[PDB]
Design an enzyme around this catalytic site. Structure first.
Site, PDB file in Angstrom:
ATOM      1  N   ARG A 365       0.794  -1.240   0.000  1.00 32.15           N
ATOM      2  CA  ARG A 365       0.000   0.000   0.000  1.00 32.15           C
ATOM      3  C   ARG A 365       0.828   1.293   0.000  1.00 32.15           C
ATOM      4  NH1 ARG A 365      -4.779  -1.541   4.512  1.00 32.15           N
ATOM      5  NH2 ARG A 365      -5.526  -3.366   3.337  1.00 32.15           N
ATOM      6  N   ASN A 401       1.692  -5.862  -2.490  1.00 38.25           N
ATOM      7  CA  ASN A 401       0.284  -6.092  -2.209  1.00 38.25           C
ATOM      8  C   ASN A 401      -0.438  -4.755  -2.217  1.00 38.25           C
ATOM      9  OD1 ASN A 401      -2.076  -7.720  -1.068  1.00 38.25           O
ATOM     10  ND2 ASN A 401      -1.744  -6.239   0.577  1.00 38.25           N
ATOM     11  N   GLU A 402      -1.561  -4.697  -2.933  1.00 40.86           N
ATOM     12  CA  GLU A 402      -2.427  -3.514  -2.983  1.00 40.86           C
ATOM     13  C   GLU A 402      -1.625  -2.243  -3.281  1.00 40.86           C
ATOM     14  OE1 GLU A 402      -4.617  -4.060   0.743  1.00 40.86           O
ATOM     15  OE2 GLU A 402      -6.066  -5.393  -0.213  1.00 40.86           O
ATOM     16  N   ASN A 403      -0.787  -2.326  -4.310  1.00 39.54           N
ATOM     17  CA  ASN A 403       0.017  -1.178  -4.700  1.00 39.54           C
ATOM     18  C   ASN A 403      -0.793  -0.127  -5.455  1.00 39.54           C
ATOM     19  OD1 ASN A 403       2.319  -3.699  -4.944  1.00 39.54           O
ATOM     20  ND2 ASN A 403       2.777  -1.894  -3.684  1.00 39.54           N
TER      21      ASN A 403
END
Ligand code: NA
Ligand code: NA
Ligand code: NA
Ligand code: NA
Lengths: 774, 803
Positions: A365, A401-403
């Site tokens: 993130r 993850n969830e970039n």
């Protein structure tokens, strides 16, 4: 020659004004005698209590550790190395007053050679006051830092401290810095190739050594042995290349490993170490499923965070062994190791238990930082691949993850994220082209990686769980290789709901809803032959700083196991689908009181892998049913039965023909027909006692004394006197502020052989009290 | 200027701990999002990180970063004006942001400083980001009191190095041209009959206005003018000498009649009229070689105290009203001199010393540890220059202090006396370059006693070393070592409300004649040679006698400049976790919440003329001894004669005589009856033709007590929502243990909360008993609670509190 440094440490929350404060003389009662340090055993985490304490933000800042080391190196002219399994997040290491090493990264392993500093200290006038021991002081810092991964937007604690083992390692002059076992297995499974490469650690610049390479099969029988005489033990060297015919294969049901044993000999040393590896062929089919050793294997997955009740990230080896065994006993064959590199103990357990692995860097993130941020991501990716390269369990290196999740910076540049993602992808392939790269949830990067996971939370964050197969089918068509990581739903352990059931005259955050959601996913997966597999998120409840208002504050409750290893009802759903060892589990072991109309036919679910099950209600048979996964829910093992107002006994008997085994389960449940009004009072009682501990129960009741069985109201426990609450565990029965589960709340009290008064508070209700005497 | 200066007190939020970057303070954050944690706390300024944890008995006080944020509504009334943030003081390292732009930083917790934010405000208001803040300007401030060996003061010091915006932060609107500095150089002639004033200023003129009209006016104590001059068309840029004038027969500033002049400056252009003012005084001071101190040509015995910026409930974040009350209390006690602890203090305090007539020693916080590197030295130089420049105009100030206990080592692995001397002399020289009208001083660094103008050794007779009857002889020996001797710091700890029938009981091992200086280890409660600090009962009864002795000796020391008791008011310190009130230095004559101790009246009876009379023992409810024992009764009074009555029966008139120690002759030995007694004292002061009286009631107990056996807990009183809870330690036979010092721990479960962490003997959830008793208040919150009372080895006791 490896010594875990666990005893005789002291810990200080907060920073020192300089290294001198850690080692200066300090008389009792002097100004130097504050701040007061706390004796601890390692591993240790800053946040063992405050991560789940409901009234504070968990501590993100510096803290210090100090010990006195007794040094005795068995090797002539040997090395002294501190080997960190992992420490959060920025660490600085001191021998007396000398800075000897530093590290940025909470999840990779690293080490510091302290040979020269120890010698200089022991030869100094300052050594006398330490009486032959060597003072070691370590600063760890988990301060928030936007230019450091992971992001504080992430759904887990960025923990601080020496929370994985720290080892004292004595070495001879010449040793191995890295051993890389490059093994490949042809598609026909009959030819294995092993290249044995190593990086030498050789600070004295010894010019020659004799190196023996021996390879043993799963039964420890030798298949190769060769001595290289007079090799240059410097930098990178290829030691051996060999072909093994008909190698014994590593498999998830029969995990078998080879062992490579390396010895380095000089006139002044004989040093032996070993490294394990396994032969296995893996293949992701284009727009198709996953094959292990030439056979389709549906990945039956979970996740885990390094987090546990009472200790936060500082789990012991024994705790890790118990957790991984619990996973294996549930039928897991695949795990994504949370959002970061995990302890090598975990990777060894996956190799030994037969659990395939996805392991990723914590680029999780926020967007994309500057040069230091990018350098950390590159370094942690290289470190993870280099350090965990040999584990046959690993099939995927994850890059993030969830970039697509923004707001750690005042800009968000999709093109810059893509450019850096492709750089990491290319680097991973230069380092290890035998494994696949992957990410989760960044649609604008889905063309970059080898394997892609979208976000699919059917029946929890969006849609209904009957949408699961359709969303998975659509998403698999968007990428060459699809693998679904993260799904599930939250359940407040011991909270149940009649609304979730098909009762004959939907409960989100109850266990009753999530068992049905899991049940549905698993039976759908039996009809999806194109599917690589999935990984449920997570195995075990874990703490997160971004959920202060969860039923257990600051805990992600999607686990099928509680944060203290207590299985939830959902554990047995997975077990009934994924294992052959006969088991049988009636839903509702922690559901004391059901409710509804007097003549209602209540749904009863049994989760079992038996071929047929007979259910009994109050001793009366309700008929035999045959297990059939597609007859949802409970794979056909469901009944609709009348409960008596009052107490009921539900019993189930199952047989599994292949094992010729009979198993049974029994629960007792009360049935309440009285309706309740709003909560009016807290009724508090001593439920049981065991030694010095008391179990206290709270029941919310209405103005007529009727139990409020649907209440989710928050309850607060306080104690005054000799005892203490057993709280801040991150569990529904180990929390001093907790939402009721069906109008109930439990907590244990350590009485300390004395007297206490417990107070029970709830907003707008009169406070209640319970006296506890010993 | 009050019209332009706005205290920013409301609508702040506070976060203990650091952010990952300024973006975290100002980024969009939806409810329930990841950006919505960590959770901030709404606060009113001034605010201190350590309002509670400094005295909380179970934690080390927080030394680290913390953040503040607010949204500023900006409306500059001046055309093309300036917007300035003016910090009275903030601890310890501060960084200031307007939106995402860093606009200023400061290192030093005790000097004032400011930041011109005009351009950053303009840039923000003109940006696309301004819309989401709805016309307001985001202001975010990071304060950091992390431990730092290369920053003064040292964590070895006996006070908290506090963190936060603990002095007022002001928003200041300025016109184009204003005054950056106003310096009033005053000198007073030989005969005190001619005064000279030089008015110097530095202009703030960022728009480069070429000409202005400047008016200089000087007003007397009534704010009526004695001088006025307008300079037409002056260049308002940089430094300008505005006026030099001779005042014949100036009104002198004095400790009994403090009279101030005011200098008012106005700068006018076609676009502005801007007025500000500064006060000053005329007075002559002289330290005599090997002799006393003279104010305006007459010897003045300095009657001194100290204070820390610290108060119950708020730590360093005292309000102006609190400061006014404290300084008034000092003046009413007879104080004419104060050393302002170990650092520059709020300008409110300096203004009050000017107005009340209290001479001042103010020092930089180079306080223990040795000597650091270049950043450390630069900070000390900077804080010294700032203190002198900022406080130069106050007539109260007579001494700039350069440091305290600089012979105290161990913040570094080296200690170099020669390097300390070299830097000390540099600081001394800088002070004299900046302000040659005042004396420099240090306390307790003998190897530097040749460097400064005025020197104080360590003399703690009867406390950290020796017996208090050696006070005069030690002072005689010490004064001969230096040209100008001034004794700062003496006294003793008293646990307020603790008293003793034998104040000297366990003081048998203490040796006289071998000094009274505090040396290494003396301050600790462990180890070391016998000393009252370690062996005394810490009763008020002992310190009252110690103070009494000091004050009567000072009447026979004609060579003495004066002394300063340490401190006026109990204050929190991180290095004393085991004190009767944990983490509080209890040497004050006033408690940390302003409640006077019995020792306050000892000073008052010696140092004031307003008639007063105080029977010792207002907070001593139960006396004890044998049946028909003659009990000593002390009366502290400045009356000429006092008559004592015990149960209505006169015990005779006694005449006051300071040298008839103790109690200046106003002592009686009287029989108490078992049970309750009423003691009344009537005094007359002939000069005032005034009579004053005091009365106390005391129980007398003849029963002897065994070891503590139980805690008896009761509701003593109630006021609105507040309950006063009392603990009494009793023996196995139920007799009150009137000499018990046992620690008592309070806990509560339920709706109420303990009124604890005040740093007072009645506001502490862990506290030593005072004569077997302990009190605490509970805020009931209109509900029900159970209070538990614990004491080591005793059964825990419980009290239900219903509303
Ligand atoms: Na928390
Ligand atoms: Na970060
Ligand atoms: Na404290
Ligand atoms: Na310092």
């Amino acid at each position: 020659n490896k010594i875990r440094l666990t005893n005789n440490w002291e810990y200080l929350k907060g920073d020192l004004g300089g290294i001198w404060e850690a080692v200066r003389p300090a008389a009792p009662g002097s100004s130097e005698a504050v701040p007061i340090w706390q004796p601890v055993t390692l591993p240790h985490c800053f946040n063992a209590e405050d991560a789940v304490d409901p009234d504070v933000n968990y501590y993100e800042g510096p803290g210090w550790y100090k010990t006195l080391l007794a040094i005795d190196n068995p090797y002539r002219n040997g090395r002294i190395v501190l080997d960190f399994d992992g420490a959060g997040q920025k660490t600085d290491v001191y021998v007396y007053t000398t800075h000897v090493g530093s590290h940025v990264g909470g999840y990779d392993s690293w080490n510091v050679d302290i040979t020269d500093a120890v010698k200089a200290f022991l030869g100094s006038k300052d050594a006398e006051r330490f009486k032959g021991k060597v003072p070691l002081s370590i600063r760890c810092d988990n301060s928030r830092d936007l230019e450091m991964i992971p992001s504080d937007l992430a759904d887990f604690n960025i923990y601080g401290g020496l929370y994985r083992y720290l080892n004292l390692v004595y070495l001879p002059e010449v040793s191995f810095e890295q051993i890389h076992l490059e093994s490949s297995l042809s598609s026909n499974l009959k030819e294995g190739i092993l290249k044995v490469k190593t990086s030498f650690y050789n600070p004295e610049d010894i010019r020659k050594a004799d190196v023996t390479v021996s390879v043993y099969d799963v039964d420890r029988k030798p298949v190769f042995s060769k001595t290289l005489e007079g090799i240059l033990p410097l930098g990178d060297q290829l030691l051996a290349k060999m072909k093994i015919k008909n190698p014994v294969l590593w498999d998830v049901d029969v995990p078998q490993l080879y062992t490579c044993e390396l010895t380095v000999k000089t006139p002044d040393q004989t040093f032996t170490t070993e490294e394990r590896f396994g032969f296995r062929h893996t293949e992701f089919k284009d727009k198709g499923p996953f094959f292990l050793n030439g056979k389709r294997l549906l990945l039956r997955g979970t996740h885990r965070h390094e987090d546990h009740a009472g200790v936060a990230q500082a789990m012991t080896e024994d705790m890790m062994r118990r957790e991984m065994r619990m996973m294996k006993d549930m039928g897991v064959n695949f795990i994504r190791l949370g959002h970061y590199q995990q302890s090598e103990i975990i990777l060894d357990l996956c190799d030994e238990l037969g659990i395939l692995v996805w392991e990723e860097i914590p680029w999780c993130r926020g967007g994309l930082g500057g040069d230091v941020y990018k350098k950390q991501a590159r370094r942690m990716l290289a470190n993870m691949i280099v350090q965990h390269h040999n584990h046959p369990a690993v099939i995927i290196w994850g890059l993030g993850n969830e970039n697509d999740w923004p707001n750690d910076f005042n800009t968000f540049d999709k093109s810059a994220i893509r450019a850096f993602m492709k750089e990491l992808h290319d680097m991973a392939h230069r380092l290890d082209d035998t494994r696949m790269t992957a990410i989760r949830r960044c649609e604008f990067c889905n063309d970059i990686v080898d394997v892609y996971s979208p976000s699919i939370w059917a029946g929890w964050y969006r849609g209904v769980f009957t949408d699961y197969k359709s969303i998975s089918e659509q998403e698999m068509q968007k990428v060459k290789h699809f693998l679904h990581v993260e799904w599930g739903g939250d359940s407040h352990a011991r909270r149940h709901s009649e609304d979730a059931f098909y009762n004959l005259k939907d409960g989100d955050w109850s266990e009753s809803y999530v068992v049905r959601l899991i049940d549905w996913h698993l039976k759908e997966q039996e009809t999806m032959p194109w599917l690589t597999g999935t990984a449920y998120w997570p195995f075990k409840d874990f703490s997160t700083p971004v959920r202060p208002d969860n039923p257990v504050p600051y805990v992600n409750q999607k686990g099928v196991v509680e944060r203290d290893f207590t299985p939830k009802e959902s554990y047995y759903v997975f077990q009934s689908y994924w294992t052959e060892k006969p088991m049988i589990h009636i839903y509702g072991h922690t559901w004391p009181v059901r409710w509804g109309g007097k003549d209602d036919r209540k749904e009863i679910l049994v989760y079992s892998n038996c071929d047929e099950v007979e259910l009994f209600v109050n001793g009366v048979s309700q008929g035999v049913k045959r297990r059939n996964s597609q007859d949802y829910p409970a794979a056909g093992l469901r009944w609709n039965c009348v409960y008596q107002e009052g107490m009921n006994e539900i019993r189930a008997v199952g047989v599994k023909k292949k094992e010729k085994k009979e198993v049974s389960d029994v629960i007792r449940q009360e049935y309440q027909t009285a309706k309740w009004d709003k909560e009016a009072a807290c009724q508090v009682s001593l439920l049981s006692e065991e030694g010095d501990t008391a179990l206290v129960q709270v029941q919310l009741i209405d103005k007529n004394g009727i139990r409020c069985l649907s209440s989710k109201k928050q309850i607060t426990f306080e104690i005054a006197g000799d005892g203490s609450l057993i709280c801040n565990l991150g569990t529904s029965t180990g929390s001093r502020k907790v939402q009721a589960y069906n109008g109930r709340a439990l907590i244990r009290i350590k009485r300390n052989e004395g007297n206490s008064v417990v107070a029970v508070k709830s907003e707008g209700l009169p406070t209640a009290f319970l006296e506890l005497k010993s």
